[PDB]
Ligand binder design. Structure first.
Ligand SMILES: [Cl-]
Ligand SMILES: [Cl-]
Ligand SMILES: [Cl-]
Ligand SMILES: [Cl-]
Lengths: 513, 504
């Protein structure tokens, strides 16, 4: 059946190559795309080819690329291969784009996801020349039905001088109705509207993105798949982490500090999250609710069983198998899922009101429970802060989960001092590794260190951590948050120099004695 | 006139010593008090005396002390002298207590001020045994009229098993009516209520704290003074900082990025804030609105001149001179000021909705614009994060302001790497020192560094910072946020070793 139900707009249909010509060197381009879902695909591929051709002739051709969050090979990948992006925000997971960022070839700033729309409207990224948005369909009155994510698309459509729509027949038609797009002032000029969400299953808007049809310069018919990353199977480390967390939830319930239905749940993606979702499926809890950035594989089963009653997100983050499950049963799942603008899914006011439980990953934390989510050795970007700050700070409970080591034991995830900080002590209450769980509620920094070192640190590193702390307590400038500035970042430099944080027995180390 | 207007509650009046005996070793005690205003005074003194005697006899006697924010010598001071506090939260500025904290003798955690109530209700500090709250009066129906701050007092009254009220005759009776206490669920069990505030001047509650009178175990008649802010005027450094900020506001308005009346304003206390407020009083922006934590001298002056229409806060921080002024004209100022619960003044949902402009101080920032608000050399507590994070992250514009150096030039306020981080890059858009203003909007870390180093750093330190950055760009593990880990914290260590960040 016809996906473009507004007859007039059919006249704007053209090839991807032609559409890409609308995008000029220097342009600021806002696109759909969040957790590898719903980003434009064919126009960026064509743009990349033309960029490379220009470069080969000594002609400059680069854009500023602002997204919802991560995209995929067709967008971040192709443009990065072409060296076609001078600035990128707010969140990337493509390896080639990451390499451009870490080489300084692409300037990058990872804004809190829930804040991106507001900062865009304030003009922080400049004037938007293009909005490039993937659609499932265009309605009779010209509404744009998003695909597998909402992200920042409404904001980009509002701001952009010209609009290009990719109508993707790969995307299931029955996605129409799953989205909730509000015309309220969430990220516009103050005073903003109250975002009146008081339950995770509440709809406040309608099913379509709105745009003046006169701004639509091109529509491209496509048929291409999202990036449905392979299911990250939980390993025994992930299962141990989930076990400690689930035991903790169980205890909170028995102490009446959580209801038996817990509270609305947010989790980052990865095998730890997968392990947690598997544990919840088998746990004693009931009537669970998701209020998160993403819909993950493990939710589909819980929505199917009835263990989870509703899941709110801005995007899908599904494996190929889960994507197939939801496509064959979209009629059912559409009734169980709400996809929102990311400035709503990640709204601090709503997150706090609902009392979300935030569960996020990390690169490392220091002994005082400051968390690095982004910068390896302090300087090399991984993905970005994403919505981890939106959720950590606003949550009823902020939980960080990670293996206690990385790189086959050569890195400790618990260090004397984080090489970069994304989440301060005040934004992290519970830490979980395969070694155990640290409950830091109501503790001073020194008390936090005692819990993190004892419960979370790996046996290969705990004595080294204890030694640093003990000597810091004796010698630190102040004793409120003891540090030895001469060696605080020395484990990181040891890794840089030698490829491991484990000390050689060929030199003196205080913990060896 | 009689301050205890509920006739029956008069029967609960007793001496401070007797009231202090209600407080036991190990107790969690929640008190009034914020920015040196409205904390209990006489019961803590009596408690401290008894604690010292107990200790001398070999008896343990310590409490957990949870407040709104800072208190004064009668509370933090006396209890610290007595070594009587095992845990303290969320914000202290008393020197004796600070010394206890920095010696490891009192455990301390500086929670975001707007979150303290919610964390207390969740049980993070444990069961509240006592609420000790200063009052201006008790009304005929048993309402508790707060004094010079609201803070967390309503939450502590809700939570505590037993309540002690200090009714202080020193406090102006005309304070009654200035407070706005909401009966809704801001910091209680989820799902919380929507707070219907959509304008800074909107009152949504009543003038009194509510408490079950059966929980009132003692009422103590007191007569003692709050602390005052300094009178001292801002110097040329603070004035230069204010100048850059005011010029910035002007340009924003001209570019239609701010309304002619700006947006609701928040500022921390200090010389720089005073300079900004003084600048605003004689400035071109009319019909200003304050939505802040505190009412300070300059804030008062603008309400007077009409340049500011209304000021919302949780507390007062006034010089003796300004206190005299407001106390002589309370009827007027009462109509211009709203004192709210700190979980409302500091609510991120409200702050973002209103689009506040946040203006905060700092100990230091690094070249990438991460800000340390709290910990000198990374380990020695100054005051605490306070509400700076509540506001910085939620604000329409987050601005940080500071002299570019301290200790007669021996410390640089701009460093290669902050020794402790309270505000991440994402939470700081604008930096101002007496050297100039760095606008970091839309910039990558390397771009941020160029601006901070060139605009904000003192000339004595700028070449050193540029040298660090240039060498980091060449030799850093990654180039997205270049660092040299061997020397990132070396300026701090140099200060520790030699008393200055300047090389020999
Ligand atoms: Cl809201
Ligand atoms: Cl806490
Ligand atoms: Cl609200
Ligand atoms: Cl920005």
């Amino acid at each position: 059946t016809e996906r473009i139900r507004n007859v007039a707009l059919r006249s704007k249909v053209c090839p991807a190559e032609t559409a890409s010509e609308l995008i000029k060197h220097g342009d600021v381009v806002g696109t759909s795309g969040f957790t590898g879902a719903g980003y434009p695909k064919e126009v960026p591929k064509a743009l990349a080819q033309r960029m490379e051709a220009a470069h080969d002739r000594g002609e400059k051709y680069q854009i500023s690329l602002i997204t919802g969050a991560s995209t995929g090979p067709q967008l971040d990948g192709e443009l990065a291969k072409a060296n076609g992006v001078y600035f990128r925000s707010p969140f990337n997971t493509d390896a080639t784009m990451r390499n451009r960022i870490n080489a300084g070839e692409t300037e990058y700033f990872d804004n809190h996801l829930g804040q991106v729309a507001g900062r865009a409207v304030q003009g922080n990224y400049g004037k938007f020349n293009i909005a490039l948005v993937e659609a499932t369909a265009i309605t009779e009155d010209g509404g744009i039905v998003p695909t597998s994510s909402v992200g920042n698309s409404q904001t980009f459509l509002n701001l952009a001088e010209k609009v290009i729509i990719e109508v993707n027949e790969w995307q299931n038609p029955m996605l129409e109705g799953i989205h909730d797009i509000w015309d309220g002032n969430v990220s516009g000029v103050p005073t903003r509207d109250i975002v009146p969400i008081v339950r995770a299953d509440q709809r406040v808007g309608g099913p379509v993105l709105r745009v003046n049809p006169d701004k639509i310069a091109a529509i491209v018919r496509t048929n291409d798949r999202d990036r449905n990353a392979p299911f990250a199977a939980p390993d025994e480390t992930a299962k141990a982490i989930a076990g400690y967390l689930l035991d903790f939830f169980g205890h909170e319930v028995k102490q009446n500090r959580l209801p038996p239905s817990l509270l609305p749940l947010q989790s980052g993606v990865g095998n730890v999250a997968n392990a947690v979702l598997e544990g919840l499926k088998e746990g004693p809890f009931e009537n669970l609710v998701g209020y998160s950035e993403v819909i993950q594989d493990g939710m589909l089963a819980m929505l199917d069983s009835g263990r989870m009653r509703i899941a709110s997100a801005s995007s899908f983050s599904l494996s190929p198998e889960a994507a197939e499950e939801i496509n064959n049963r979209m009629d059912f799942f559409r009734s169980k899922i709400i996809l929102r603008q990311q400035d709503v899914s990640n709204s601090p006011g709503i997150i706090r009101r609902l009392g979300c439980i935030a569960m996020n990953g990390m690169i490392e934390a220091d002994i005082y429970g400051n968390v690095n989510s982004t910068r390896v050795m302090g300087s090399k970007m991984m993905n970005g802060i994403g919505g981890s700050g939106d959720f950590a700070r606003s949550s009823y409970l902020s939980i960080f989960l990670s293996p206690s080591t990385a790189k086959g034991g050569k890195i400790s995830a618990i260090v004397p001092m984080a090489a970069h900080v994304d989440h301060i002590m005040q934004d992290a209450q519970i830490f979980v590794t395969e070694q155990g769980l640290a409950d830091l509620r109501g503790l001073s920094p020194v008390q936090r260190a005692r819990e993190i070192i004892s419960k979370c640190a790996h046996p290969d590193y705990r004595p080294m951590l204890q030694d640093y702390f003990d000597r810091a307590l004796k010698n630190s400038f102040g004793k409120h948050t003891p540090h030895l500035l001469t060696e605080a970042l020395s484990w990181h430099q040891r890794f840089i120099d030698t490829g491991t944080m484990l000390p050689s027995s060929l030199e003196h180390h205080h913990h060896h004695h």
